[PDB]
Amino acid sequence: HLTMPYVMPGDGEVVGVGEPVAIRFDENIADRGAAEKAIKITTNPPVEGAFYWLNNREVRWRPEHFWKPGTAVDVAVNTYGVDLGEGMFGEDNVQTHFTIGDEVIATADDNTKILTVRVNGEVVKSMPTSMGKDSTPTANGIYIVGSRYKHIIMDSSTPVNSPNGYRTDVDWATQISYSGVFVHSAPWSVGAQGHTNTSHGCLNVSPSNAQWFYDHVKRGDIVEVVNTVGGTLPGIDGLGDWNIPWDQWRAGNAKA
């Protein structure tokens, strides 16, 4: 009858301008309003934000726009002993502090087949890319950079021998959606990068470019995909928060 909150990002971290505050519980929350009221977010410089639930165990908070670089964020999850509904109580408080880093926005434009990285507005890298082929296209939209992996076997069985299924080992992989979109090294498609889309949705770039991305792009930085033949990344993907328009985000879903 206890539930433990977990806050992201990590205490003392620096994150990109796309990073939401995330409070994830190890049980379904029956009273979402109770959880929201127990969570106090302090920003400096101060900016308005709001709560939106990705699912029954995880609430996010973000401002209307990407964070301003240098902002300091304090998160007080004051859930100890709080009645979260159906006889579940908060197991502990959590308290985190983080800061927002430089503005890093990478745009993958299917009309040019280039992934351009801008840091505080200036182009710092121009990376030819091969994105999802027409039958398995990369969705347009705004992606929040997540975790990074020096190498990772992307086994879609998280079934491989099924229609648009796969199992591949890749290097220098930066996660940009929970739906399994990565930026990663694809030495096999360098010829195609800048010209032809060949993937299941991942942003294929050169080994050099993928390692640069792994080294320089941090959690909370933004990738924007534009002009593909795909749909739009779902707002509730897990890293798709910004595809939910602010009016809808701000309204929340505490009663859903």
In angstroms, how far is the first alpha carbon of the chain from the final one?
22
90: CATH: 2.60.40.3710
119 and 235 share a domain? Answer: yes
Owning domain of residue 26: 2-101
16 appears as a binding residue in the annotation? no
Determine the Cα–Cα distance for residues 233 and 228; give it in Å rounded to an integer. 12
End of a domain among 101, 120, 148? Answer: 101
Alpha carbons within 13 angstroms on the beta-carbon side of residue 36 total 19
Q: How many domains does the chain have?
A: 2
22 and 131 share a domain? Answer: no
The catalytically annotated residue of 97, 151, 184, 200 is: 184
Assess contact for 42 and 76: CB atoms under 8 A: yes
Assess contact for 17 and 69: CB atoms under 8 A: yes
109 and 235 share a domain? Answer: yes
204 and 180 share a domain? Answer: yes
The answer to the question of residue 219 being in a domain is yes
Element (H, E) at 157: none
83 appears as a binding residue in the annotation? yes
Whether 184 sits among the annotated catalytic residues: the reply is yes
Residue 251 phi/psi, 5-degree rounding, is -60, -30
Residue in the block written with tokens 């050169």: 206
The answer to the question of residue 247 being in a domain is no
Q: Which amino acid is at 216?
A: H
The answer to the question of residue 255 being in a domain is no
CA separation (Å) from 177 to 45, 80, 181, 182, 219?
Answer: 29, 32, 5, 7, 12
Assess contact for 170 and 157: CB atoms under 8 A: no
191 appears as a binding residue in the annotation? no
Determine the Cα–Cα distance for residues 40 and 220; give it in Å rounded to an integer. 21
204 appears as a binding residue in the annotation? yes
Assess contact for 250 and 64: CB atoms under 8 A: yes
End of a domain among 101, 126, 156? Answer: 101
Q: How many CB atoms lie within 10 A of CB 188?
A: 11
End of a domain among 73, 101, 129? Answer: 101
- Chain centroid to Cα 131, Å, comes to 18
Task: Give the list of residues 6+ apart from residue 245 with CB closer than 8 angstroms, or none.
Answer: none
93 appears as a binding residue in the annotation? no
108 and 158 share a domain? Answer: yes
Long-range CB contacts for residues 44-51, cutoff 8 Å, separation at least 24: 44/71, 44/72, 45/71, 47/71, 49/21, 50/249, 50/250, 50/252, 51/252, 51/254
To 5 degrees, how large is the angle CA 120–CA 122–CA 128? 120
Q: Which amino acid is at 179?
A: S
Task: Give the list of residues 6+ apart from residue 251 with CB closer than 8 angstroms, or none.
Answer: none
